[PDB]
Design a binder for this molecule. Structure first.
Ligand SMILES: Nc1nc2c(ncn2[C@@H]2O[C@H](COP(=O)(O)O)[C@@H](O)[C@H]2O)c(=O)[nH]1
Length: 903
């Protein structure tokens, strides 16, 4: 096995790298890199090494690493361009792993942890670590074990040990429900005092120094804390030991925040899972609380409990510890069905960057490219700083607030990267410039066609249609690769079927599984020798096909990500290959392509229906368009259908048959008009929506930009049993709306889209009546005290006070007769409730810690003085009104003269 690295780091004039050797052993190296740089030489040179612009370069070998840093500084000062990879780590890696990679993973020490601390006020400061760490869970990927560090004695109450068996019991058995398979994994360890707890943990670390490091919110909390705490009581001199190279760097951040430090641990690759998820989930979420995610992601949730989180140890150490183990597991479980860490491995291993650098598109891509060129003796530019310049972005049509029964949408595949490829946009393919007319004129083909030999953008640009641009040819490769791997992933799957089937008519003695590539399909030759196999040789044979199917796809996905992040790096100033023009070129082209096809579509359609100027294109956003089908349907009469579904196929066919070919054919025009290099602008149908047929429902309706809801039957061809609801921007998600109301509005909406006014009305009446009898929490509002709590503290209020913060002060004011039981409110997430007129608390609203009940000393008073109507209105009716207005509907039946009569 050809080795591979784990981590790299530059300290002084040397590279420090933990890597696995030939026979899988974690070793440490200190190499004094002799980095080489470049400078432009006069034409009359015997050289290879030419930049992306052709100009010749000569190599400059440095001997000593900081010499090169000096050198660079120098050239710049003079005015001379200094070329090459200014980042040496990356230089090293290419230079040392000059081959495709092949990494293991079972040989990579991913440590996953979560620490816990107790505090009167729910949150301690990672910055100063005043409070003792009381619990630490550390799952080790290599050992596949959970190490638990438990603090028996604390000034916040000493406690009893913990029971593995009680942890095992069911909910009703006063048990914690920790899953069996995990139970014999746990390695509990209790401790008297903190000094020992830490001490030991420290030793555990140096003994099993981690490579990747995860957790949930580990980076912003867990890590900074562990770090400081130890520093505080044992001195930084020793805290540094967390670095396998004992080098460390603190760094402060800001915002409303201010002193939010982050410690970079030299030697290890922190990869907070909250980010890891944020970036690759492909699913936009409203909150990132570990509960909510593990709930949607895995259905289960978080260990439920009584009382505030600052009490749980003091009030139920058994569960306190149990919950830690649960948490760490959650993540483990998520990474299993999502493979995020692995993916990270793959990605970084491809590009040859520090793993964490995965988070940065800039670093990632810069590397790739550098490598590509590197093997063709070309030289990369040099990072030039540029000013931030507010260029145009995606196009979003302003919709007409109304109801739209039948609707269907289409998607531009990949867009930005496709555009790049179509126009052949590159820093070194820039041909010229041209007199540019108002964009509007271009999307109408009114403006006169620019260059007769250049690929252009509507902003005035023109690029050569000859030389293949560094960037487009680069993307292309990746885009080819995904096609390649998606291919494999699919082969080992349908090949996986072949094995699963021949296992029912198993065994024909004692044999050997075979040397077969699993990436491609089988061949009758091997399809036969297979029937002849045993349940021992097969099965094992299956594992191999099952594992290559996982690999192939984990690689395929990798590509998908690259492609998406690319525009984001071009649009970024630190990008070595940045250029505002290229940037504005892309975005404006997109901007046009859309409204151009918008025109084309309306054009085509109202001609096919024999109508005039009717605009079907209802809305558009970035890469998608939403057409109105209302007309088409009425044309062939609603009654001519005998089945909700029956229509869907019709629209579907119409799309793929009439529409799509028209679209592409009308898109070709544009390609010639701008006279680009290839066609690449493809759009395919995707959603199809409308009310159930017979149902007096409305299908969909829009409130405004990015604010709409639709009843969907078909999506990208795959049909639905029950209609699904694509809700967008309409606050059924906004974490601020009461959990009760969120389900309530969702229903109203469904009742609108599928049933119609009549249905909606009766519901409104129901939840309205029952509203009063519900649990307060579910109907309370939620916001976060952005700690601007300071900004006011006149002990009392003081103008410009947001309603939010208004209630907080009135809480703390009345909290005065504390008893310690009232959990102090500290700069983070709250509840808030109305409060009728003349209430004895003063002010006219209260708020308290999220996820906590309210201290009985006042709780009942509060409830008594709740302003239900005010509540109802601001939280439920107002957002509701918004919807009804747009859809021309009424949620309250007005006077029918037939009232007063008894039918
Ligand atoms: N081709 C190329 N090599 C670079 C660049 N910056 C640094 N290098 C160094 O050039 C040397 C290798 O060239 P090769 O061995 O492939 O002919 C290595 O020391 C490599 O790290 C760059 O922009 N292009």
């Amino acid at each position: 096995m050809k080795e591979f690295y784990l981590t790299v780091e530059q300290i002084g004039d040397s590279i420090f790298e933990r890597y696995i050797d030939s026979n899988g052993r974690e070793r440490t190296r200190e190499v004094e890199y002799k980095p080489s740089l470049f400078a432009h030489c006069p034409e009359s040179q015997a050289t290879k090494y030419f930049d992306i612009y052709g100009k010749p370069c000569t190599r400059k070998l440095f001997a000593n690493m900081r010499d090169a840093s000096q050198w660079i500084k120098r050239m710049e000062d003079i005015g001379l361009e200094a070329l090459g990879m200014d980042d040496f780590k990356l230089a090293y890696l290419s230079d040392t792993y000059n081959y495709e990679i092949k990494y293991d993973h079972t040989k990579i020490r991913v440590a996953n942890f979560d620490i816990e601390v107790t505090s009167p006020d729910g949150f301690p400061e990672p910055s100063q670590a005043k409070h003792p760490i009381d619990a630490i869970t550390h799952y080790d990927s290599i050992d596949d074990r959970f190490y638990v560090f438990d603090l028996l004695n604390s000034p916040y109450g000493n406690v009893e040990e913990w029971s593995i068996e009680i942890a095992a019991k069911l909910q009703e058995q006063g048990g914690d429900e920790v899953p069996s398979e995990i139970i014999d994994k746990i390695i509990y360890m209790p401790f008297d005092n903190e000094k020992e707890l830490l001490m030991e943990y420290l030793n555990f670390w140096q003994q099993k120094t981690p490579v990747i490091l995860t957790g949930w919110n580990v980076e912003s909390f867990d890590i900074p804390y562990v770090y400081n705490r130890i520093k505080n009581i044992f001195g930084e001199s020793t805290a540094k030991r967390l670095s396998p190279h004992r080098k460390t760097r603190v760094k402060v951040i800001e915002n409303m925040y201010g002193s939010r430090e982050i410690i970079t641990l030299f030697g290890i690759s922190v990869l907070d899972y909250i980010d890891l998820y944020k970036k690759f989930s492909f699913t936009n979420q409203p909150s990132y609380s570990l509960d909510y995610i593990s709930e949607f992601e895995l259905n289960v949730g978080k260990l439920k409990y009584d009382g505030p989180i600052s009490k749980l140890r003091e009030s139920n150490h058994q569960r306190y510890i149990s919950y830690n183990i649960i948490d760490v597991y959650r993540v483990l479980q998520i990474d299993a069905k999502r493979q995020f860490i692995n993916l990270s491995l793959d990605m970084g291993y491809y590009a040859k960057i520090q793993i964490q650098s995965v988070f940065s598109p800039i670093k990632t891509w810069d590397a790739i490219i550098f490598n590509s060129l590197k093997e063709q003796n070309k030289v990369i530019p040099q990072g030039r700083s540029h000013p931030v310049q507010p260029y145009p972005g995606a196009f979003v049509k302003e919709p007409i607030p109304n109801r739209y029964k039948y609707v269907m949408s289409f998607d531009l595949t990949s867009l930005y990267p496709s555009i790049i490829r179509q126009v052949n946009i590159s820093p070194e393919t820039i041909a010229g410039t041209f007199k540019v007319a108002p964009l509007h004129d271009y999307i109408n083909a009114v403006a006169e066609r620019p260059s007769d030999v250049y690929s252009c953008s509507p902003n005035g640009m023109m690029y050569y249609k000859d030389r293949d641009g560094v960037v487009p040819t680069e993307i292309t490769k990746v885009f080819n690769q995904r096609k390649e791997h998606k291919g494999y992933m699919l082969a080992a799957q349908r090949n996986g079927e072949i094995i699963k089937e021949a296992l029912h008519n198993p065994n024909l003695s004692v044999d050997e599984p075979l040397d077969v590539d699993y990436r491609f399909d089988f061949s009758d030759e091997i399809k036969e020798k297979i029937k002849k196999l045993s349940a021992k040789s097969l099965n094992e044979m299956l594992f191999r096909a099952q594992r290559t199917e996982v690999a192939g796809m984990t690689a395929q996905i990798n590509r998908k990500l690259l492609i998406n992040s690319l525009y984001g790096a071009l649009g970024n100033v630190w990008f070595r290959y940045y250029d505002l023009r290229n940037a504005t070129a892309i975005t404006t082209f997109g901007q046009m392509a859309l409204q151009w096809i918008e025109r084309k579509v309306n054009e085509y359609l109202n001609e096919v229906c024999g109508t005039e100027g009717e605009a079907f294109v209802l809305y558009g956003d970035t890469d998608s368009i939403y057409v109105s089908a209302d007309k088409i349907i009425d044309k062939v009469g609603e009654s001519k259908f005998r089945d909700t579904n029956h229509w869907v196929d019709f629209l579907d066919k119409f799309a793929r048959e009439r529409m799509e070919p028209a679209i592409d054919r009308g898109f070709r025009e544009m390609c010639e008009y701008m006279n680009n290099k290839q066609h690449l602008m493809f759009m395919d149908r995707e959603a199809i929506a409308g009310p159930p047929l017979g149902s007096k429902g409305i299908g969909g309706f829009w409130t405004g930009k990015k604010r709409y809801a639709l009843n969907v039957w078909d999506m990208e061809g795959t049909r639905y049993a029950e209609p699904k609801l694509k809700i967008m921007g309409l606050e059924t998600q906004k974490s601020s709306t009461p959990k009760a109301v969120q389900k309530a509005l969702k229903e109203c909406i469904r009742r609108m889209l599928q049933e119609g006014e009549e249905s909606l009305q009766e519901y409104f009446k129901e939840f309205e009546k029952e509203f009063r009898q519900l649990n307060y929490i579910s109907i309370a509002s939620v916001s976060s005290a952005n700690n601007i709590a300071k900004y006011d503290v006149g002990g009392f209020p003081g103008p410009k006070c947001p309603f939010h913060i208004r209630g907080i002060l009135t809480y703390n004011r009345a909290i005065k007769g504390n008893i310690d039981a009232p959990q102090v409110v500290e700069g983070e997430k709250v509840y808030v409730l109305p409060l009728r007129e003349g209430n004895p608390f003063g002010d006219k609203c209260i708020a308290w810690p999220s996820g906590t009940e309210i201290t009985d000393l006042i709780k009942d008073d509060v409830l008594h003085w709740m302003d239900y109507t005010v509540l109802l209105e601001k939280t439920f009716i107002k957002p509701l009104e918004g919807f009804t207005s747009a859809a021309k509907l009424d949620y309250e039946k007005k006077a029918s003269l037939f009232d007063m009569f008894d039918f």
